[PDB]
Amino acid sequence: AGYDRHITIFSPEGRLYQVEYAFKATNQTNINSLAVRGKDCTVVISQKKVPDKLLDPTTVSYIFCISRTIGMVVNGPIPDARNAALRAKAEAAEFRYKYGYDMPCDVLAKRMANLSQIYTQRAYMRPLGVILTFVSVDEELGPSIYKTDPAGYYVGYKATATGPKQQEITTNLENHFKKSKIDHINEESWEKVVEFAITHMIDALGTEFSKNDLEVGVATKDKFFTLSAENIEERLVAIAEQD
Amino acid sequence: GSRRYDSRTTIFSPEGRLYQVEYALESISHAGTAIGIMASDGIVLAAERKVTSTLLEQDTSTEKLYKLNDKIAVAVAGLTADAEILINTARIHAQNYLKTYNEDIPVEILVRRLSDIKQGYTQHGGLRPFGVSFIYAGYDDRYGYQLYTSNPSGNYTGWKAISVGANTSAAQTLLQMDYKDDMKVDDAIELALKTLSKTTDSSALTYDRLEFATIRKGANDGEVYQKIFKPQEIKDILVKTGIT
Amino acid sequence: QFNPYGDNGGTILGIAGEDFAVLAGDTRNITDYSINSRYEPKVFDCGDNIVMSANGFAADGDALVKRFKNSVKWYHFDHNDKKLSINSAARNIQHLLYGKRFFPYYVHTII
Amino acid sequence: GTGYDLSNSVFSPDGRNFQVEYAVKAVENGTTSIGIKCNDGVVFAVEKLITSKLLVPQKNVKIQVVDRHIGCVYSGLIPDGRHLVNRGREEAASFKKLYKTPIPIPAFADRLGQYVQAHTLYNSVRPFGVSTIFGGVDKNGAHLYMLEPSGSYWGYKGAATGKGRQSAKAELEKLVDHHPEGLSAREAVKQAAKIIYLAHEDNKEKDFELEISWCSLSETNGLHKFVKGDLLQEAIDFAQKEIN
Amino acid sequence: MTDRYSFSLTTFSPSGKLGQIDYALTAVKQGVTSLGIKATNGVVIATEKKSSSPLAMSETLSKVSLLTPDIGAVYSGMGPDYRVLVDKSRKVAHTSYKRIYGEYPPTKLLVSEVAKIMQEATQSGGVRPFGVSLLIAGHDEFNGFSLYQVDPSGSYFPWKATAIGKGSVAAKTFLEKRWNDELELEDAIHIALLTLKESVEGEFNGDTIELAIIGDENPDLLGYTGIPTDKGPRFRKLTSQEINDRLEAL
Amino acid sequence: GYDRALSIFSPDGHIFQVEYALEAVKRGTCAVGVKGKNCVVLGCERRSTLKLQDTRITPSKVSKIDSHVVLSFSGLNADSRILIEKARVEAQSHRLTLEDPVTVEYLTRYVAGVQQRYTQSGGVRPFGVSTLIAGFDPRDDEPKLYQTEPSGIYSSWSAQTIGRNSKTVREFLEKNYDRKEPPATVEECVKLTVRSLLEVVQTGAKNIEITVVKPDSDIVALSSEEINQYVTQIEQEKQEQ
Amino acid sequence: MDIILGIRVQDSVILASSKAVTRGISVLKDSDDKTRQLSPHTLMSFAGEAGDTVQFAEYIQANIQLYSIREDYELSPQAVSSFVRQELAKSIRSRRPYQVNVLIGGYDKKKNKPELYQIDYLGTKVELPYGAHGYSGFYTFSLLDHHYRPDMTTEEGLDLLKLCVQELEKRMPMDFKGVIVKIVDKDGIRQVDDFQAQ
Amino acid sequence: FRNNYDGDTVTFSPTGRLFQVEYALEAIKQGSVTVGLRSNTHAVLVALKRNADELSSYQKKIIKCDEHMGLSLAGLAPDARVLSNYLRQQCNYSSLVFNRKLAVERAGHLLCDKAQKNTQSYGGRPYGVGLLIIGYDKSGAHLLEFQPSGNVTELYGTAIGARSQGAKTYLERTLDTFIKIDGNPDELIKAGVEAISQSLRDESLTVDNLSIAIVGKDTPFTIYDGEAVAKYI
Amino acid sequence: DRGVSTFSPEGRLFQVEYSLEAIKLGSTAIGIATKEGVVLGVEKRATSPLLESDSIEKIVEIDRHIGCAMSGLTADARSMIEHARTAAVTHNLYYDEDINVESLTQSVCDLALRFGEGASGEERLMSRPFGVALLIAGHDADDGYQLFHAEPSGTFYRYNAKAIGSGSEGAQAELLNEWHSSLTLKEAELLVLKILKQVMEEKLDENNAQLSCITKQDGFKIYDNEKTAELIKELKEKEAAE
């Protein structure tokens, strides 16, 4: 009777506790990340925290390059993150081979969310304690943000945030879009869209960043790429000459 | 491992009973009452619909009375979904016999095979048994008009008049009180309506809460005909019998 | 089309005495009109005082002797180092040969 | 309630896998082992607790080679470490069979990472009771990695796990600070010997044997080789000099 | 590895109750209210698009889905469980019917196929029942217009009008008062917007409400012309503008 | 898929699932078998919890495995059908390969072998059925009577009973059956069968069924009147004293 | 091929099957019974491939006897023939088909009428007043088209078979060593042990 | 504590232990004592066989793997049969495919990996037997101690079973003596008999009780029992 | 619950140890091996007088030179006897010789530990261990007359004399004093018959007790009731002597 909280079966309230505890595992890393849409680009900013001095900082990453076009930032433990990363890369390559065109951002999100649903229904597979955020400039939909969770739920976003301090970043973005009356960041170059994302990250968290505190991923037409420590440094100089 | 969460559906009690079989019979005892009565010139199937509304479409509704063969039909008590899985396999078995021998399947053979499937879930597999009781009304050239019943244990018996579902003890006492061996179908139709009306948990027995089916060999034909009563046809016979 | 079989020639001879037995065989290995080897042992000591030679197709001959020598080895492992008698060896080789009834060892073996 | 720590794949109320955390306790109980990344290679060193004089010296090898360029060393349950190296050897051979080039170190790290992570997804399998320090030289420089029972791995300038991991990490941090330009392969072998001897104080009750291996581009042609003979003794003396 | 859960996770309790089905129905009760009304010349299905965040685009999440060009479906309960059932229902319509008979299955049979999938998730080894109830509305040549409700148990019933979810009890009572067997399609849509308002707490507009109808054939949505027998799909999702125009005549 | 070990040993050296399977036999209706000099008789009692059954079609307790062998049982009615079916298939399989019908011992050995298999296989529960297998060996006039049980143990009896109140009827047979003079006539063999049942049945003319097996495929089941004539004669034996 | 003859008269079915078993050069047996009793009122004769011929017949016999005990009922001659046809129909598309041609003659106790069915190895079933397999039909069909009447008694049918055998002995090259004749009616199956000189 | 985590081998304890493995190790300590020791030329297995009754036989403890390899058992006999038969196959595979005598070190690697697989998967149980493998290959004489945990260690001399500490302490002291017994099989056996007598407590080693096996430079693995071990009592 | 192949804190298998308790409830079986032959004797133990005692088969023939006695759950033995009979005949087919008694016993014991719900090793498809112990007795040219005790544990011991079943502990203690390496075939016949009489709940006669022997000359032979009854009479007269 008390094993309803051990396996993915319904509780007397109609809840699934194992799914709920998988949601709690997503904040284990204590990392905040946001995603915003430009005029023709999509940018993801994530917190980079290297505690041990013995670690090689270049290997510490939660942003993954799934395909040529699609990128993915993860909130949760790295072993489960890399499990979801390898699968997404395998699904992206297979789709192109079978259907003759690069898998869209929303389709990859739906496919990964459908897989997350299986762990929610079947008993032997545990849910992955990670929240996946897919970003790309689709050849049909344009700049796109799609986010999946352990529940098997997915939806599109004008902009999004994930982490322990998610709510503070979310309301900060909401209030900007209520003011601007548009669903995107009206800017031509991606550099300024990255600059926007860093600025509103600082304002929401109330914390200043160095070049090693952040992790940036930029999605453009036909390409997704991650910014190096010097690329972020140039971006931090530009926002400093405004405040 | 996984052993921790195993309910063990196919085990004996210290007394020598089968837990899941016993509890499945408890599940059926709450479902709508279904009655079968055998007459000298046909068989009568009658079933009471469990839970009805004003906005429930009755014309396209079929929850208790199903057609397996051109000669064999069933009454359902218990889970509707679990029944349809067993009904589908029974229809296939009936067609497999017709393909093999070029003859319509005898009633008992179809009943036994369906009961043997229920038996399988009782002995092995680790899965729950089907929470369904059937009343088989059928005709073949060997025994004529036949009435069978089967339960989650996989056991089947023959009857002259039988009831499954809710208030079987009350329904069986009333049937045993008024049944005679030389009954006509019209008398059996009346008995079925009188038995249901007294075992109903609701206020009054109306047409929208009933399903009716008769299997008769029409004297002006020489062949067996199955007649699943329409909403209006149930409404008519309800007035004629003196229930209105 | 690929032919799995071949012929390596040679000849073997086995004569039993009153208290002894000989198994002879030429050391010449050939293919068609060419000589492969002038010294290639064909008769083998398999242990338990038993000698064996399979003559015909060299690859099948070597595989059969290798399988029999190994069959004697496992006979000791399973039966408390019991000596394999000559009549027991002969019956064992029958099952080794008939095992490949539909893809036969192309050899005439003598023990 | 409780019981969240009995099954493997079960999430506890705080989003933790206790069976994984219990496997780390088996690693912490195990022998101390280290890894040092130098300017063109990596150096692996391991403590070997001599239980009695009956143990044959220089025989019970703990450091294992994967392919021809990767070296692996682990702490905790030795048989579990051997199983992981066996899988890694199959995984390295599978890569070379299809792609011709020997498996890159970041590639090999993920291959073990996914395999260990797989043992945290099912209740039918037990997590690995080992933390593996591994690395080598490939197309673009040298790499050093440390893998956890959770499946978590990162790149390391200096890695340490086992009984005296804290004493080792403190000594490794001193090297990173004092050598920003990068330690040499010759210096890394000597220093690894010292760190093991200093980390041995957490297990100073038992006598131990030192075992060192290295993979350097200039010293060993990028191939994994064991430190033997004069260079081994030179390292032992360097450690025995600075222990007092 | 290997699924060692070969035994049933849903079993009969001493009282005769199947716990996991009862709890799955409890999860349906927590879900957002959805409704369906059958008229003389069409069937309407509607639900509230409960936006989890104002930053999230409600358009990219369809609670009402097309199964066949003549059959639509809406739910109440668990979103992910519904989404996979839609994909299974769309495929079973082809594999078990259209690839055999060359035509799309009638409403009653497609509902029966969905019911089978959900029934198996109740009996099969190592699975939990679907935490969703479905409202399936469709049209076929020999049955006309029909509406069905599928439960986690696998049981299904035809309806003239019904609602499931949060305030299903209060919605059904209101539907009983306003329904008659002489309603036009537009009248059914009008009542649908009236009944759904009582369940909606916040904004009630064409952006927060998802509505679709099974009515007349749409040759404009066919995509091709030339074949006389092909006259277009009967299923049509109403746009954000089409809802707002009818909300003014509320 | 499902291979969970249901039938297992307990601290005191018992397999409870096999033990409770015999408790299911104790619940089932009583079945008795006696062998005379040239005939075997199987008698079974009929349940009276519900009385409105169609006796023509309702499955009888005594089932024919072959033309010369019969099988009666006690316990679960659903489990017995599987044992009878497997025995009937094996009966035909033996006639096919050996070119000779089964001996009563061999058919018993098969049924007991199937029951034993279910006591040490994963994912299955043992049969809640004990059987009485009677008949005559091919071209042999020697009567045969065997008994199997859930545990898989089988043995031959001169007289045996199984089911509910089988403890009472066995006592009767232990002090009424003599091995020196087995019932030499079919009539007195049936009489002893009815007498032993009347100790349990408690006045049941329609509750007692009698089947007689004779050598060379001669099996016949007695009608209600034929059995009723024995009951009437037996009730006189008590009253004449 | 072997001789398999069948004729349905007024109240019975008569089957005549050759006695000779020949393997290559020698006649090994001259008293072979090329027929099996499937049920008390149904008989099946067979000819074809050396090994398949008896193996198929006994396999069918086992299944009909199994059904007869399970249901305590005898299948109609139509139902038995439909079972045999399906078995051969599955066989023809298998790895190694049964090369057996059968004649099924039985008396239907319900209809009180004799019935004869002819099925080849392909699974082609047909109901006939008279049937033959192999090369026997090339001589016998024209004979039976001329002399056959439906109201003929069992004795009349035996005389008609005698006329068929005499033609087969005269015109056929193979020595089939005569035939074994069996009658299937309401009383069951009996063998005519005096057909050597009837 | 212990009762919750000893249900199967798949479960770790809060301290990081495997109790089912530890219980399998307890099966060795219940078994009869056996001694292994080697020099630079030979390797000897001296095994004390156990009888159930005085009417029973002293069950065999030494199993031959190949002409150059063999092992002694302590604990469960059928678990020793499975592992020895596996090692018989591996020695045979190396000789048939590679024409190569399997190294004793690699034989220990193979027994380690096979025993490990039973300690990670659900359903399976650990092997309940300790093994002492001796062998002479291309690198001289060898002695290996196998444990159900999977741990295999190369040693000069050792003993496993009941009261095995008495023999192990002796060999730890006699270390510098028996390692130098080269070219003499009899003296190496006598050192093993003196080792196994240190573990004695119940009785004295008799004729049908003592079991001695030897393999070396010019000695194929041969097992001596009864009359052949009378000159060592 | 708990696994069928679970170890106890003492280092034993639960299901194996519980299986030995089931044999302790079974009928008594005694075997004595001499230089003239091996003698086997069992207790029939009929549950009712109506039970035909000759149908009780607890001593079975594996081969002409190998026979065995069973104790405990006798139904579990049927597959073990089948395997033993097959292995003896299959060895005769492969090697044109008689199988060694040790080799036969080893083949039977190879099935004992083949139980589990999915134990990693091969494919052990059996839910529980056998509930029966065997007394395999025979003769071969290499080791002479032999007596083996096969357990559900997979282990087998060779005995000069062994008793298993209900009175196994008291009978074995009796066998300790009575056995010597110079016993004749007849001496062992009365000895089994005497010790059975002690441990049996019923009075020993030729109907509830059965004897059998394996010799090099005649092979495995089961003693008929007439032959056994004469030995009981001889045993009664020798005990009444002193």
Swiss-Prot record, chain B:
One of its GO terms (cellular component) is nucleus. One of its GO terms (biological process) is proteasome-mediated ubiquitin-dependent protein catabolic process. It is found in: Cytoplasm; Nucleus. Keywords: Cytoplasm, Isopeptide bond, Nucleus, Proteasome, Ubl conjugation. Its main location: cytoplasm. It comes from the Eukaryota. There is a cross-link at K99, K198, K230 (Glycyl lysine isopeptide (Lys-Gly) (interchain with G-Cter in ubiquitin)). Present with 17100 molecules/cell in log phase SD medium. The proteasome degrades poly-ubiquitinated proteins in the cytoplasm and in the nucleus. It is essential for the regulated turnover of proteins and for the removal of misfolded proteins. The proteasome is a multicatalytic proteinase complex that is characterized by its ability to cleave peptides with Arg, Phe, Tyr, Leu, and Glu adjacent to the leaving group at neutral or slightly basic pH. It has an ATP-dependent proteolytic activity. Belongs to the peptidase T1A family. NCBIfam families: PRK03996.1 (NF003075). The 26S proteasome consists of a 20S proteasome core and two 19S regulatory subunits. The 20S proteasome core is composed of 28 subunits that are arranged in four stacked rings, resulting in a barrel-shaped structure. The two end rings are each formed by seven alpha subunits, and the two central rings are each formed by seven beta subunits. The catalytic chamber with the active sites is on the inside of the barrel. PANTHER family: PROTEASOME SUBUNIT ALPHA/BETA. This is Proteasome subunit alpha type-3.
Curated annotation (Swiss-Prot), chain C:
Belongs to the peptidase T1B family. It is found in: Cytoplasm; Nucleus. Keywords: Cytoplasm, Nucleus, Proteasome. Non-catalytic component of the proteasome which degrades poly-ubiquitinated proteins in the cytoplasm and in the nucleus. It is essential for the regulated turnover of proteins and for the removal of misfolded proteins. The proteasome is a multicatalytic proteinase complex that is characterized by its ability to cleave peptides with Arg, Phe, Tyr, Leu, and Glu adjacent to the leaving group at neutral or slightly basic pH. It has an ATP-dependent proteolytic activity. GO terms for biological process: proteasomal ubiquitin-independent protein catabolic process; proteasome-mediated ubiquitin-dependent protein catabolic process. The keyword Nucleotidyltransferase does not apply. The gene is PRE7. Its main location: cytoplasm. The 26S proteasome consists of a 20S proteasome core and two 19S regulatory subunits. The 20S proteasome core is composed of 28 subunits that are arranged in four stacked rings, resulting in a barrel-shaped structure. The two end rings are each formed by seven alpha subunits, and the two central rings are each formed by seven beta subunits. The catalytic chamber with the active sites is on the inside of the barrel. The chain holds residues 20 to 130 of 241 of the full protein. GO terms for cellular component: cytosol; nucleus; proteasome complex; proteasome core complex, beta-subunit complex. This is Proteasome subunit beta type-6.
Swiss-Prot record, chain D:
The keyword Signal does not apply. GO terms for cellular component: nucleus; proteasome complex; proteasome core complex, alpha-subunit complex; proteasome storage granule. The gene is PRE10. Its main location: cytoplasm. It comes from the Eukaryota. It is found in: Cytoplasm; Nucleus. The 26S proteasome consists of a 20S proteasome core and two 19S regulatory subunits. The 20S proteasome core is composed of 28 subunits that are arranged in four stacked rings, resulting in a barrel-shaped structure. The two end rings are each formed by seven alpha subunits, and the two central rings are each formed by seven beta subunits. The catalytic chamber with the active sites is on the inside of the barrel. The chain holds residues 5 to 248 of 288 of the full protein. This is Probable proteasome subunit alpha type-7. Keywords: Acetylation, Cytoplasm, Nucleus, Proteasome. Disulfide bonds: none annotated. Belongs to the peptidase T1A family. The alpha and beta forms are probably products of the same gene with different post-translational modifications. GO terms for biological process: proteasomal ubiquitin-independent protein catabolic process; proteasome-mediated ubiquitin-dependent protein catabolic process. GO terms for molecular function: mRNA binding. It comes from Saccharomyces cerevisiae (strain ATCC 204508 / S288c). Present with 12000 molecules/cell in log phase SD medium.
Swiss-Prot record, chain E:
SUPFAM superfamilies: N-terminal nucleophile aminohydrolases (Ntn hydrolases). There is a cross-link at K108 (Glycyl lysine isopeptide (Lys-Gly) (interchain with G-Cter in ubiquitin)). It is found in: Cytoplasm; Nucleus. The keyword Ubl conjugation applies. One of its GO terms (biological process) is proteasome-mediated ubiquitin-dependent protein catabolic process. SMART domains: Proteasome_A_N (SM00948). Coiled coil: none annotated. Present with 7060 molecules/cell in log phase SD medium. The 26S proteasome consists of a 20S proteasome core and two 19S regulatory subunits. The 20S proteasome core is composed of 28 subunits that are arranged in four stacked rings, resulting in a barrel-shaped structure. The two end rings are each formed by seven alpha subunits, and the two central rings are each formed by seven beta subunits. The catalytic chamber with the active sites is on the inside of the barrel. PANTHER family: PROTEASOME SUBUNIT ALPHA/BETA. This is Proteasome subunit alpha type-2.
